[PDB]
């Protein structure tokens, strides 16, 4: 409780309000608010792994995960679908994958040409500190 309570969230980049996490042709990308269930993520603390899993409300047997190419993915449940969030300011988090890649952590990251992310896929890339703008994502309601 208090900290990321189970429920239905929206997921943005700090690079722009007015854009939401959504799946498209099987990638995850930030897109224009559609007020629909495609953009609503159900996030569930699983106390057995002290980590959280995140399902897509409109296809809720599919969870956020990643592939052996860089990308974050929607997939059926897997240990990869487990995430270990770090809050660093109201509603903003740096999502680390629970299980470490080599000796170093990875995170959701998203590229910006100039604080612009329009057509960009969400990927999984090494993390280091709390100071990477791209690694930062905000989860509301």
């Amino acid at each position: 409780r208090t900290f990321l309570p189970n429920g239905n969230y929206n997921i943005k980049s700090i690079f722009s309000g007015s854009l939401y996490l959504s799946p498209v042709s099987g990638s995850l990308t930030f897109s224009n608010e559609s007020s629909a269930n495609n953009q609503k993520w159900n996030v569930e603390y699983m106390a057995e792994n002290r980590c959280f899993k995140i399902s897509n409300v409109a296809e809720p047997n599919k969870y956020l995960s990643y592939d052996n190419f860089g990308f974050i993915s929607l997939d059926s449940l897997s240990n990869r679908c487990y995430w270990f969030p770090i809050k660093i300011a109201v509603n903003t988090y740096i999502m680390l994958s629970l299980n470490k890649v080599n000796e170093l952590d990875y995170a959701w990251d998203i590229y910006d040409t100039n604080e612009n992310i329009l057509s960009q896929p969400l990927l999984l890339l090494p993390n280091f500190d709390i100071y990477n703008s791209n690694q930062m994502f905000k989860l509301e309601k």
Partner: protein, 286 residues
């Protein structure tokens, strides 16, 4: 810009026989067997301000189509040239294995990846595998590095340039009976920077000019160097695919038709380069 504006075949490092090839009906790019065809070819365009290249297909009935990572998906396709960020690429020579990583200007964390199973192109993040590494090479030296073929004059074909017999060499023009003395294996030599023309009827036997005879041409066993042996193939850009076989010993010496006689028996000779037409020739699959 070192190779800028060049015409090129990209093949996969994880499969030497697979080429970037554009599929006629629409805009798929696919990894395909060797093809000696415009569809196999791509010219590279540098942009000084974007500091990066785009890759354009020489599809003749679909000009101005270029390699294009589709917005957020994993998919590489060919597209109408908006001339946008998704349509540019950084070319990165590996220097170790001498191949290229091709990374998207749009987001250069992601790189071209060869999906060998399902024979199309995809994106992946950087790693050491050979799925992200690629061979880029001069369309001509690719089409001719090891091509076993027949040669026909620009003047009406098929009459093919052949050696007369396994027993007797020389070199004549004839109508295409399939006898392998008319089948002709051309193989590139990086060091010399030129191609030899082997005969099949007996390998080790290669197409040669002669010394103390200038016009005359024949076949002989390979020798050091040898300067007389070896040749330079050069296209004549247009709808084209018609080439010009030029000797290394004397660069003004081009393979000639001896007045372009169009009948069986004719000597094949070698001349100065004014041509043009007996000098010109095309080459193709048995």
């Amino acid at each position: 810009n070192s190779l800028n504006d060049k015409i090129v075949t990209i093949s996969c490092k994880a499969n030497t026989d697979l080429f970037f090839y554009q599929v006629p009906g629409n805009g798929n790019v696919s990894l395909f067997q060797q093809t000696r065809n415009y569809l196999e070819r791509w010219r590279i365009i540098y942009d000084s301000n974007k500091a990066a290249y785009k890759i354009k297909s020489m599809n003749i009935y679909n000009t101005n189509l270029v390699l294009t990572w589709n917005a957020p998906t994993h998919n590489i396709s060919a597209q109408q040239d908006s001339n946008a960020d998704n349509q540019y690429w950084l070319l990165l020579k590996d220097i170790g294995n001498n191949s290229f990583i091709i990374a998207s200007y749009k987001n250069p964390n992601l790189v071209l990846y060869a999906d060998t199973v399902a024979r199309n192109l995809k994106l992946s993040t950087l790693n050491n595998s050979s799925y992200i590494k690629f061979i880029i090479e001069d369309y001509v030296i690719s089409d001719f590095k090891n091509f076993t073929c027949r040669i026909s004059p620009i003047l009406a074909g098929g009459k093919v340039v052949q050696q007369v017999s396994m027993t007797n060499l020389a070199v004549n023009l004839y109508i295409w009976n399939n006898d392998l003395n008319q089948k002709w294996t051309i193989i590139y030599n990086e060091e010399k920077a030129a191609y030899q023309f082997f005969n099949k009827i007996l390998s080790n036997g290669v197409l040669t000019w002669i010394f103390s005879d200038g016009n005359t041409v024949r076949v002989s066993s390979s020798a050091q160097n040898n300067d007389a042996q070896y040749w330079l193939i050069n296209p004549v850009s247009d709808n084209y695919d018609r080439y010009t076989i030029t000797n290394l010993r004397d660069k003004t010496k081009v393979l000639d038709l001896y007045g372009g006689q169009t009948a069986d028996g004719t000597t094949i000779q070698v001349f100065n380069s004014n041509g043009g037409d007996n000098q010109i020739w095309t080459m193709s699959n048995p």
